[PDB]
Amino acid sequence: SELLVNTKSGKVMGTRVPVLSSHISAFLGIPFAEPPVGNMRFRRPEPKKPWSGVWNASTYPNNCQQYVDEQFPGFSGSEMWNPNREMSEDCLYLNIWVPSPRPKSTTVMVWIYGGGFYSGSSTLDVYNGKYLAYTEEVVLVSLSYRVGAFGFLALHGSQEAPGNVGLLDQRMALQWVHDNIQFFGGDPKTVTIFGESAGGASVGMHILSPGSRDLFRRAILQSGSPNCPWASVSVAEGRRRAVELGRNLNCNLNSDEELIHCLREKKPQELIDVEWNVLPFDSIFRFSFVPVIDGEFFPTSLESMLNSGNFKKTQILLGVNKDEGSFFLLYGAPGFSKDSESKISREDFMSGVKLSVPHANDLGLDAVTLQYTDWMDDNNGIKNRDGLDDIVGDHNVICPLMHFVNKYTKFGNGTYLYFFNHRASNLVWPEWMGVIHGYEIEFVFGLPLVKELNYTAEEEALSRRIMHYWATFAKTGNPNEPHSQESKWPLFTTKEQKFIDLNTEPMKVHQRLRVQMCVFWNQFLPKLLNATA
Amino acid sequence: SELLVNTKSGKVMGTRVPVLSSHISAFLGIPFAEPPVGNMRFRRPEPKKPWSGVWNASTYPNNCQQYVDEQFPGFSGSEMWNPNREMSEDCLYLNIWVPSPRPKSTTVMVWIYGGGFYSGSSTLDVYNGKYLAYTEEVVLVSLSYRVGAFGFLALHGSQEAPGNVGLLDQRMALQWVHDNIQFFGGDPKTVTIFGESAGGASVGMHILSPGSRDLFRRAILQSGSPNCPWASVSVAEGRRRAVELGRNLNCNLNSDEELIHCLREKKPQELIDVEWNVLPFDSIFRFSFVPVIDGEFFPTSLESMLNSGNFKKTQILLGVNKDEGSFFLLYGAPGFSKDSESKISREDFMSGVKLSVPHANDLGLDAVTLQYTDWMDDNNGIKNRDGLDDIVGDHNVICPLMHFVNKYTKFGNGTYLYFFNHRASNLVWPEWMGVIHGYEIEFVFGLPLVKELNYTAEEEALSRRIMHYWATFAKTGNPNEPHSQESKWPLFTTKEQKFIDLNTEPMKVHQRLRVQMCVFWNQFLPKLLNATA
Ligand SMILES: CCc1c2c(nc3ccc(OC(=O)N4CCC(N5CCCCC5)CC4)cc13)-c1cc3c(c(=O)n1C2)COC(=O)[C@]3(O)CC
Ligand SMILES: CCc1c2c(nc3ccc(OC(=O)N4CCC(N5CCCCC5)CC4)cc13)-c1cc3c(c(=O)n1C2)COC(=O)[C@]3(O)CC
Ligand SMILES: *[C@@H]1O[C@H](CO)[C@@H](O)[C@H](O[C@H]2O[C@@H](C)[C@@H](O)[C@@H](O)[C@@H]2O)[C@H]1NC(C)=O
Ligand SMILES: *[C@@H]1O[C@H](CO)[C@@H](O)[C@H](O[C@H]2O[C@@H](C)[C@@H](O)[C@@H](O)[C@@H]2O)[C@H]1NC(C)=O
Ligand SMILES: *[C@H]1O[C@H](CO)[C@@H](O)[C@H](O[C@H]2O[C@@H](C)[C@@H](O)[C@@H](O)[C@@H]2O)[C@H]1NC(C)=O
Ligand SMILES: *[C@H]1O[C@H](CO)[C@@H](O)[C@H](O[C@H]2O[C@@H](C)[C@@H](O)[C@@H](O)[C@@H]2O)[C@H]1NC(C)=O
Ligand SMILES: *[C@@H]1O[C@H](CO)[C@@H](O)[C@H](O)[C@H]1NC(C)=O
Ligand SMILES: *[C@@H]1O[C@H](CO)[C@@H](O)[C@H](O)[C@H]1NC(C)=O
């Protein structure tokens, strides 16, 4: 009964599931913490009290309370990210995918979903771990964590709403995986945590946080970095938004205790409905309740931690996608559409620049504009559009990640940089959107392997290659074949700063990813805004 | 006796001179002002007292007291700009070149030599007007004006050293040409003033100055603009330098009167020897004593005058050369040589950036650096060198001229923009220096016509074309042939902003000359320096 597993918390009943004309085990819904309900809302997670009998882990668990995207109802493109289960605070569970026969001490891979820290679900179709676990014979785990106010409300000082609880949720799952994954054939001394966007930033935060370092071996970061403009706030801003939320809900503000009590009575949807109202600016790619630089989970400022090398030192595989910004412009910028090539005008361009760099003063905006405007042809609808895409991309994902890369590689043990630039043949979004943020995931989890998903043959190869790189890396700390003859994915070094692209064509090696624009975002603009303010 | 001319100041005896196996008249040394000597030093020029008898104008006059370049002794490249006559304060004379037979009421062209306002001579070989006057049958005139302290010392308030006297010198020559050029077959109602570098800036200043507008019809500007960073200073800076000069010469400073008396006793070389010591910065392309925004010669600030359209409205022909900055880097930047391809290092590059933009604060310097550095290959010796060339070029000549162009064309009557990018076949300077500042002059005056100067056949064509454009323009206000079939030199308009290049190849039309870099120099950087200071 490989489906009947006994863990240090209780027994769990699995379920056999088909995968590419075969089967593997699957334990969905394993609880790793007491339900963050009632007075637990906002508090740090508490480990799951051991249970009696057999816990049925055959179906997927609930999804955490979140904002649901309904801008394009009845459109797979955006609906594929929405909660596909019943939302509920009681949502701290994790899913495992064990190969069959159940191996022992095999590479473990824990996935942490993205979603800007305000949304996400471990139960999406696109995150079905059966293919990867099957094809690469690994123990694929998918955790979950609180999001929105629920997971990141921060009244620094209080013990009721300390902030970063959502990250602590991830830590406790990693801890569980630590103590129980061996009972599933997993090797706790060989765990790779990986995630995309907010999930990626999460991985990076676990690398930095002293209280998480010992819970994993190596890590992967997809289109996300711990130092991203949107991935965290100061204790002060965190407290400002928390109060604002309260004001937004007619609450006693006089003290933390009174405010916590008020927010703890409100139904989940009440909080969610006014969640966006706390942001300081009109903007895109900015999220209300995110990790807060607390001095605890994060010893000191992120930048200082990176300089001093105060962070876990291991191997990391990370990269980005060609058009990271397109997805956000569609949702927030003026002029963008899903039903047209969205040629942007000069006036809308100026508008998008503001929404994209909300914290910028007027001179800053000029800087950004000058940097991304071709004055030899500035009324070119196409150009302006691609210009915004790059701005949103470079500022929020690519350059922040590159800064992280360079900074990490000085103390790291092995850095692998990729540039995903393949436009899926069956993508439901229009063409101007290019290689959209988050669309490398379907290849990482190997959906191009499902013949019914009408992908191309060449795309099945890519997905198999990508999973192999991801699997091999988590297993060895290197994605390259021990000694194949296939082109090697070079090691990113401080001097050569090499990286490769990921697509159907033959591998190619490049250097200094968007180095020019990144000098602008990482060195210059920060200085300009500091001096002129 | 076409050589014997009677003017409203006295008679003058000319001299016949050979030109391309033929002859024309030439009156060298016509005095148009009382010698600015003794107590006249620094004062506004006074018209030349009518003389008795026949003034012999067969030889060239003296050159004004100036700093002599002796960085490359015995090298035609730099020596061709040095005074080729005996320097002396008594230097206010002008030269005329009248075709033979002496025509009547023909197009007149007055040349104003450049030299950063600290040097220059109307008697250089490269400025011999016999070819142009001969080939294009025009009355070519070459004036002179005081330079250095002598021509621009400015103690605003005083009447002894009011500043801008040097420009007034040019005005009085233009006035003379006005009242006497008809006696030489010239048409005072058809005078075109043209000059290069400081001379060009001069032309532009005459266009702006209310007291000069009526002295000419149309104008030409070569690699020089009235609004250039180096072409003028505020009344305050003007007074600061004047004092500094005095301090530099152990003078009573207590009052203008005492300081003027002191500077009026010192021999010309004394002043000249400490002339560079007054600049506020360590730098290249910056000159000690230049035009001062006085509220008189210049009603108000240059920028305001250009916005309000407060300036002479006529036709103008102007342009620049491909490598304006090279000449100055050779003389002031670290790393540059005449005996090598001057591949510049990253450290010397940073140094040159400072010398090139002396008025910039640290953030400004960063801006400039980021704008001209290719971070995909920043140790490329070549690139850095060309980068400096462009910086020095764009900041000091090209973008300032472009700003002038755009601003003028809103009220102008006809604007023609050229981009001289032909590298003379016999240039004595090394190749890296490209198309050096001031080397379009030899073609304007048509030296490629002299077979003994070993130019190419193709270069004789260019020189003849160029002179024709220059001549035809001064004659009609349009350089194009009334109705030839040759490619037309389009009119620069605010919308299309067209211009053409000048070289041996077939004409080509372009648009928005260095528009990208100019947005940086004309809009952004000025704003950045304003905000952050
Ligand atoms: C309509 C909901 C919605 C609102 C706001 N911002 C959004 C940003 C992004 C998305 O969608 C994605 O990001 N995407 C959805 C998520 C998707 N992921 C999914 C998982 C993997 C990566 C891709 C990418 C596209 C939806 C948003 C917002 C902002 C503000 C409001 C306000 O009422 N709203 C409502 C009031 O006042 C303010 O001052 C202001 O802060 C600023 C003006
Ligand atoms: C050696 C003389 C010389 C000096 C300085 N600057 C020069 C600039 C340019 C040339 O030559 C050309 O421009 N060129 C010569 C002129 C030529 N024209 C000719 C006509 C048509 C255009 C081309 C172009 C090349 C010669 C220079 C200078 C500067 C300063 C001194 C100081 O002692 N000097 C001496 C002290 O203290 C300061 O703080 C400082 O201001 C800044 C550090
Ligand atoms: C748990 O295992 C059960 C077999 O012992 C299986 O029948 C359950 O499937 C579904 O049953 C229905 C009645 C409902 O309870 C639904 O939630 C279950 O998914 C399976 N699921 C449970 C109850 O956890
Ligand atoms: C003025 O015309 C003279 C003929 O009447 C001619 O001889 C002069 O030539 C040069 O003569 C010598 C002696 C010397 O004065 C020199 O300066 C003259 O150039 C000519 N030049 C003058 C005197 O102005
Ligand atoms: C390839 O699989 C697709 C899965 O999304 C499917 O939509 C395509 O359509 C066909 O299969 C099902 C889903 C149904 O729509 C049927 O009517 C279609 O034949 C499928 N490609 C095709 C056209 O065969
Ligand atoms: C073409 O004219 C040049 C003018 O500068 C000259 O230097 C070249 O040299 C010859 O003429 C004179 C000047 C002298 O140097 C003589 O020895 C040379 O033959 C001249 N080109 C040549 C080489 O004929
Ligand atoms: C990682 O560490 C091992 C041994 O500690 C060392 O041999 C290796 O060079 C390191 N990896 C890199 C390339 O940083
Ligand atoms: C110059 O003025 C004339 C008449 O005043 C006018 O016809 C012409 O269009 C003007 N030139 C331009 C193109 O500005």
mmCIF file of N, CA, C and O and ligand atoms in Angstrom, chain A residues 451-454, ligand 5:
data_model
loop_
_atom_site.group_PDB
_atom_site.id
_atom_site.type_symbol
_atom_site.label_atom_id
_atom_site.label_comp_id
_atom_site.label_asym_id
_atom_site.label_seq_id
_atom_site.Cartn_x
_atom_site.Cartn_y
_atom_site.Cartn_z
ATOM 1 N N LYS A 451 -0.518 15.492 -25.607
ATOM 2 C CA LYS A 451 -0.880 15.575 -27.025
ATOM 3 C C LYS A 451 -2.195 16.298 -27.276
ATOM 4 O O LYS A 451 -2.371 16.933 -28.313
ATOM 5 N N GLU A 452 -3.114 16.189 -26.324
ATOM 6 C CA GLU A 452 -4.429 16.814 -26.435
ATOM 7 C C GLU A 452 -4.396 18.331 -26.279
ATOM 8 O O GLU A 452 -5.381 19.000 -26.562
ATOM 9 N N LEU A 453 -3.272 18.872 -25.817
ATOM 10 C CA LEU A 453 -3.146 20.313 -25.628
ATOM 11 C C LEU A 453 -2.647 21.009 -26.882
ATOM 12 O O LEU A 453 -2.209 22.159 -26.836
ATOM 13 N N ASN A 454 -2.721 20.291 -27.996
ATOM 14 C CA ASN A 454 -2.316 20.768 -29.333
ATOM 15 C C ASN A 454 -1.107 21.723 -29.423
ATOM 16 O O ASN A 454 -1.211 22.839 -29.943
HETATM 17 C C1 LIG C 5 -6.824 19.718 -29.524
HETATM 18 O O1 LIG C 5 -7.054 19.785 -28.114
HETATM 19 C C2 LIG C 5 -7.687 21.010 -27.717
HETATM 20 C C3 LIG C 5 -7.688 21.065 -26.205
HETATM 21 O O2 LIG C 5 -7.966 22.381 -25.744
HETATM 22 C C4 LIG C 5 -9.089 21.063 -28.293
HETATM 23 O O3 LIG C 5 -9.705 22.291 -27.924
HETATM 24 C C5 LIG C 5 -9.068 20.929 -29.824
HETATM 25 O O4 LIG C 5 -10.433 20.729 -30.297
HETATM 26 C C6 LIG C 5 -10.931 19.413 -30.458
HETATM 27 O O5 LIG C 5 -10.982 18.650 -29.233
HETATM 28 C C7 LIG C 5 -12.039 18.961 -28.269
HETATM 29 C C8 LIG C 5 -11.425 19.771 -27.143
HETATM 30 C C9 LIG C 5 -13.268 19.619 -28.913
HETATM 31 O O6 LIG C 5 -13.130 21.034 -28.925
HETATM 32 C C10 LIG C 5 -13.479 19.084 -30.329
HETATM 33 O O7 LIG C 5 -14.666 19.641 -30.876
HETATM 34 C C11 LIG C 5 -12.281 19.423 -31.228
HETATM 35 O O8 LIG C 5 -12.243 18.517 -32.329
HETATM 36 C C12 LIG C 5 -8.139 19.794 -30.314
HETATM 37 N N1 LIG C 5 -7.835 19.994 -31.717
HETATM 38 C C13 LIG C 5 -8.660 19.536 -32.654
HETATM 39 C C14 LIG C 5 -9.424 20.568 -33.472
HETATM 40 O O9 LIG C 5 -8.826 18.334 -32.869
#
